[PDB]
Design a protein around this nucleic acid. Structure first.
Ligand SMILES: [Zn+2]
Lengths: 148, 92
DNA sequence: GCAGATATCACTCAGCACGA
DNA sequence: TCGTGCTGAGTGATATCTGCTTTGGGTGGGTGGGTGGGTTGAGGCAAT
């Protein structure tokens, strides 16, 4: 019926693998090992890593939509659309089985009272003075914060 | 590519439709002397429009009535049933 | 690959005259 | 008195098509990028 994410009201987060646990059980911890914005290269894309730095910019909390809810003025049926990108295209015509069997051209209208939102913040992290090589300037890495 | 939805005798004769009207039409509709004529007309049109929307959302109320007129003029099976209801009353 | 403005073709419906 | 087959007419959906930049300016940025470009001069006001 409805997408699973809509009913969810919890946020799942991962705590890195502490060095003590890794050394206890004879393993190497890649996630907890602190790095610098300089060392975050393309090879680390898609992994859980730790970054050490100084925050230099924060943004106001804004609602980022996760599941949009529409209402058909004819059926009385609600249509849910998942959004998982920086941009999305709103729906226009109803896709309900009622609008299909009757082939009515009902119009979908957005309703923010039933949608799902998650708090969003964008920040910047910069390297400390102890990590910049001589003759080089500090670099900045964007951080996205969602949930709690 | 796709045939248009149309108010055929099959839809009218289904459980929803004329059987639905005969089942519950006098109970919901009520013309009262105390109330003004406009209110009674509004109530009757309110019942019939709700029934039409439940049955045939495609067409508006006036279009629904005109289509009903045309279908009643054309369809013979609809005439069969329409005569039948009157015949039962003559029997009663 | 994607949204928008535009024009093309095909299908189905209400009127008409005649014949039953 | 009347029933039905043929016709012109008009939308609906769908086919090709152009376009997909655009723009001068810092409340559009620099993780959008310089083969997309931006080349003053007088007058007012704080510091002294
Ligand atoms: Zn609908």
């Amino acid at each position: 019926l409805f997408p699973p994410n809509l009913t969810r009201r919890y946020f799942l987060y991962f705590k890195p693998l502490s060095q003590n646990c890794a050394r206890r059980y004879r393993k190497k911890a890649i996630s907890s090992k602190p790095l610098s914005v300089r060392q975050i290269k393309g090879d680390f894309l898609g992994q859980l890593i730790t970054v050490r730095g100084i925050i230099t910019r924060v943004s106001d909390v804004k609602p980022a939509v996760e599941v949009i809810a529409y209402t058909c003025d004819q059926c009385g049926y609600e249509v849910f659309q998942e959004v998982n990108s920086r941009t999305f295209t709103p729906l226009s015509e109803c896709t309900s089985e009622e609008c299909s069997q009757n082939q009515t051209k009902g119009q979908l209208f957005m309703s923010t009272r039933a949608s799902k939102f998650s708090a969003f913040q964008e920040c910047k992290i910069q390297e400390l003075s102890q990590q910049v090589p001589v003759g080089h300037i500090p670099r900045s890495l964007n951080i996205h914060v969602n949930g709690t | 590519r796709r045939p248009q939805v149309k108010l055929t005798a099959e839809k009218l004769l289904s459980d929803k439709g004329l059987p639905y009207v005969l089942k519950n039409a006098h109970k919901r509709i009520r013309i009262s002397s105390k109330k003004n004529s406009y209110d009674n007309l509004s109530n009757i049109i309110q019942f019939y429009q709700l029934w039409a929307h439940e049955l045939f959302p495609k067409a508006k109320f006036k279009d629904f009535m005109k289509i009903c007129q045309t279908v009643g003029k054309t369809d013979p099976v609809l005439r069969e049933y329409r005569v039948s209801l009157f015949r039962d009353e003559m029997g009663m």
